[PDB]
PDB file of C-alpha atoms in Angstrom:
ATOM      1  CA  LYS D   1      -0.381   0.116  -0.137  1.00  0.00           C
ATOM      2  CA  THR D   2       1.332   3.403  -0.738  1.00  0.00           C
ATOM      3  CA  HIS D   3      -0.333   4.635   2.994  1.00  0.00           C
ATOM      4  CA  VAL D   4      -0.137   3.136   6.573  1.00  0.00           C
ATOM      5  CA  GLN D   5      -2.031   3.968   9.449  1.00  0.00           C
ATOM      6  CA  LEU D   6       0.156   3.506  12.021  1.00  0.00           C
ATOM      7  CA  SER D   7      -0.101   5.053  15.954  1.00  0.00           C
ATOM      8  CA  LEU D   8       2.904   6.510  17.119  1.00  0.00           C
ATOM      9  CA  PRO D   9       4.001   6.799  20.997  1.00  0.00           C
ATOM     10  CA  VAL D  10       4.478  10.403  21.972  1.00  0.00           C
ATOM     11  CA  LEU D  11       6.810  10.527  24.064  1.00  0.00           C
ATOM     12  CA  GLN D  12       8.323  13.373  26.250  1.00  0.00           C
ATOM     13  CA  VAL D  13      12.342  14.628  24.899  1.00  0.00           C
ATOM     14  CA  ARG D  14      14.098  14.238  28.634  1.00  0.00           C
ATOM     15  CA  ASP D  15      12.429  10.992  28.301  1.00  0.00           C
ATOM     16  CA  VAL D  16      14.106  10.027  25.134  1.00  0.00           C
ATOM     17  CA  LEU D  17      17.291   7.173  24.624  1.00  0.00           C
ATOM     18  CA  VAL D  18      18.285   7.363  21.550  1.00  0.00           C
ATOM     19  CA  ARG D  19      17.872  11.020  20.156  1.00  0.00           C
ATOM     20  CA  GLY D  20      18.254  10.576  16.265  1.00  0.00           C
ATOM     21  CA  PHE D  21      18.432   8.515  13.490  1.00  0.00           C
ATOM     22  CA  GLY D  22      21.682   9.178  11.753  1.00  0.00           C
ATOM     23  CA  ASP D  23      24.339  11.386  10.657  1.00  0.00           C
ATOM     24  CA  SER D  24      23.115  12.236   7.117  1.00  0.00           C
ATOM     25  CA  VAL D  25      19.587  13.274   5.269  1.00  0.00           C
ATOM     26  CA  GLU D  26      19.768  10.179   3.755  1.00  0.00           C
ATOM     27  CA  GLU D  27      20.328   7.842   6.751  1.00  0.00           C
ATOM     28  CA  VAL D  28      17.391   9.575   8.894  1.00  0.00           C
ATOM     29  CA  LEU D  29      15.020   9.220   6.314  1.00  0.00           C
ATOM     30  CA  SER D  30      16.389   5.789   5.220  1.00  0.00           C
ATOM     31  CA  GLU D  31      16.066   4.949   9.623  1.00  0.00           C
ATOM     32  CA  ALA D  32      12.649   6.917  10.095  1.00  0.00           C
ATOM     33  CA  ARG D  33      10.979   5.043   7.094  1.00  0.00           C
ATOM     34  CA  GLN D  34      12.607   1.644   8.287  1.00  0.00           C
ATOM     35  CA  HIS D  35      11.293   2.044  12.405  1.00  0.00           C
ATOM     36  CA  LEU D  36       7.591   3.091  11.577  1.00  0.00           C
ATOM     37  CA  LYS D  37       7.847  -0.342   9.255  1.00  0.00           C
ATOM     38  CA  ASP D  38       8.994  -1.759  12.227  1.00  0.00           C
ATOM     39  CA  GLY D  39       6.655  -0.135  14.841  1.00  0.00           C
ATOM     40  CA  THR D  40       9.924   1.392  16.340  1.00  0.00           C
ATOM     41  CA  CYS D  41       9.211   5.219  15.635  1.00  0.00           C
ATOM     42  CA  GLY D  42       8.402   7.350  18.430  1.00  0.00           C
ATOM     43  CA  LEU D  43       7.090  11.049  18.257  1.00  0.00           C
ATOM     44  CA  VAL D  44       8.239  14.032  19.705  1.00  0.00           C
ATOM     45  CA  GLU D  45       5.961  16.947  20.185  1.00  0.00           C
ATOM     46  CA  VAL D  46       7.708  20.382  18.987  1.00  0.00           C
ATOM     47  CA  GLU D  47       8.237  23.361  21.332  1.00  0.00           C
ATOM     48  CA  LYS D  48      10.473  26.105  22.486  1.00  0.00           C
ATOM     49  CA  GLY D  49      13.982  23.958  24.042  1.00  0.00           C
ATOM     50  CA  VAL D  50      12.822  20.499  22.576  1.00  0.00           C
ATOM     51  CA  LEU D  51      14.943  20.806  19.191  1.00  0.00           C
ATOM     52  CA  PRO D  52      18.166  21.545  20.359  1.00  0.00           C
ATOM     53  CA  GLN D  53      17.998  18.661  22.807  1.00  0.00           C
ATOM     54  CA  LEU D  54      17.625  16.082  19.709  1.00  0.00           C
ATOM     55  CA  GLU D  55      20.578  15.421  17.558  1.00  0.00           C
ATOM     56  CA  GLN D  56      21.000  16.493  13.629  1.00  0.00           C
ATOM     57  CA  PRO D  57      19.712  15.622  10.791  1.00  0.00           C
ATOM     58  CA  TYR D  58      15.709  15.707  12.087  1.00  0.00           C
ATOM     59  CA  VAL D  59      13.187  13.846  10.702  1.00  0.00           C
ATOM     60  CA  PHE D  60      10.040  15.871  10.816  1.00  0.00           C
ATOM     61  CA  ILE D  61       6.317  13.967  10.239  1.00  0.00           C
ATOM     62  CA  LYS D  62       3.742  16.928   8.321  1.00  0.00           C
ATOM     63  CA  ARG D  63       0.775  16.978   7.350  1.00  0.00           C
ATOM     64  CA  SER D  64       0.151  16.629   3.730  1.00  0.00           C
ATOM     65  CA  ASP D  65      -3.445  16.738   3.828  1.00  0.00           C
ATOM     66  CA  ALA D  66      -6.435  18.828   5.241  1.00  0.00           C
ATOM     67  CA  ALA D  67      -7.806  12.342   7.975  1.00  0.00           C
ATOM     68  CA  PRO D  68      -8.975   8.912   7.182  1.00  0.00           C
ATOM     69  CA  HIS D  69     -10.353   6.626  10.499  1.00  0.00           C
ATOM     70  CA  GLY D  70      -8.875   9.581  12.799  1.00  0.00           C
ATOM     71  CA  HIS D  71      -5.291   8.824  10.522  1.00  0.00           C
ATOM     72  CA  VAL D  72      -3.960  12.348   9.654  1.00  0.00           C
ATOM     73  CA  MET D  73      -1.730  11.824   6.503  1.00  0.00           C
ATOM     74  CA  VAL D  74       1.687  13.001   7.314  1.00  0.00           C
ATOM     75  CA  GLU D  75       4.763  12.840   5.518  1.00  0.00           C
ATOM     76  CA  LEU D  76       8.539  12.813   5.724  1.00  0.00           C
ATOM     77  CA  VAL D  77      10.428  16.296   5.932  1.00  0.00           C
ATOM     78  CA  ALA D  78      14.735  15.616   7.055  1.00  0.00           C
ATOM     79  CA  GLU D  79      16.790  18.887   8.388  1.00  0.00           C
ATOM     80  CA  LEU D  80      20.202  19.593   8.791  1.00  0.00           C
ATOM     81  CA  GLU D  81      21.913  23.164   9.339  1.00  0.00           C
ATOM     82  CA  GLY D  82      18.727  25.042   8.703  1.00  0.00           C
ATOM     83  CA  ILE D  83      17.671  23.004   5.340  1.00  0.00           C
ATOM     84  CA  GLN D  84      14.993  21.096   4.733  1.00  0.00           C
ATOM     85  CA  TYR D  85      14.597  17.523   2.426  1.00  0.00           C
ATOM     86  CA  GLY D  86      10.903  17.816   1.513  1.00  0.00           C
ATOM     87  CA  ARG D  87       8.098  20.492   0.940  1.00  0.00           C
ATOM     88  CA  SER D  88       5.015  19.162   3.195  1.00  0.00           C
ATOM     89  CA  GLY D  89       2.004  20.964   5.511  1.00  0.00           C
ATOM     90  CA  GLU D  90       2.137  21.959   9.344  1.00  0.00           C
ATOM     91  CA  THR D  91       4.940  19.741  11.767  1.00  0.00           C
ATOM     92  CA  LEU D  92       3.430  17.333  13.877  1.00  0.00           C
ATOM     93  CA  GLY D  93       6.736  16.382  15.955  1.00  0.00           C
ATOM     94  CA  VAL D  94      10.028  14.823  14.928  1.00  0.00           C
ATOM     95  CA  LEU D  95      10.442  11.037  14.889  1.00  0.00           C
ATOM     96  CA  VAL D  96      12.928   9.197  16.821  1.00  0.00           C
ATOM     97  CA  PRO D  97      13.820   5.727  17.423  1.00  0.00           C
ATOM     98  CA  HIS D  98      11.302   4.085  20.391  1.00  0.00           C
ATOM     99  CA  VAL D  99      13.233   1.934  22.303  1.00  0.00           C
ATOM    100  CA  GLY D 100      10.603   1.105  25.407  1.00  0.00           C
ATOM    101  CA  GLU D 101      10.431   4.847  26.950  1.00  0.00           C
ATOM    102  CA  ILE D 102       6.594   4.988  28.330  1.00  0.00           C
ATOM    103  CA  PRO D 103       4.355   7.677  25.886  1.00  0.00           C
ATOM    104  CA  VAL D 104       2.221  10.227  27.393  1.00  0.00           C
ATOM    105  CA  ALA D 105      -0.463   9.704  24.450  1.00  0.00           C
ATOM    106  CA  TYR D 106      -0.632   7.828  20.675  1.00  0.00           C
ATOM    107  CA  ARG D 107      -0.979  10.001  17.387  1.00  0.00           C
ATOM    108  CA  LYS D 108      -2.816   8.352  14.141  1.00  0.00           C
ATOM    109  CA  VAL D 109      -0.983   9.256  11.492  1.00  0.00           C
ATOM    110  CA  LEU D 110      -1.755   7.496   7.860  1.00  0.00           C
ATOM    111  CA  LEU D 111       1.599   7.755   6.324  1.00  0.00           C
ATOM    112  CA  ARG D 112       2.486   8.187   2.394  1.00  0.00           C
ATOM    113  CA  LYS D 113       5.049   5.622   2.229  1.00  0.00           C
TER     114      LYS D 113
END
């Protein structure tokens, strides 16, 4: 399928043990896609002081449409030194590896794969 219904665990930034997916825009987008497929991807909601606590390059999920079965349609945009790779809508949050952190909530998304 071109789209996949996921429920992403929402993590507090101070709980996150692995604070990014790797060391290049291509690697982080690759890794984010693999973890999203394996159910091992968390979401951190972006506010003042969150991004400097995470590792660049960043992977964002961004609203791609204005929500089948409650799932907001999203796509992946990466960011490194203030340049973004991709063009999409509003940020729902930044993706990180999920290694067993306790979530505060779940974000239902329909991911363009």
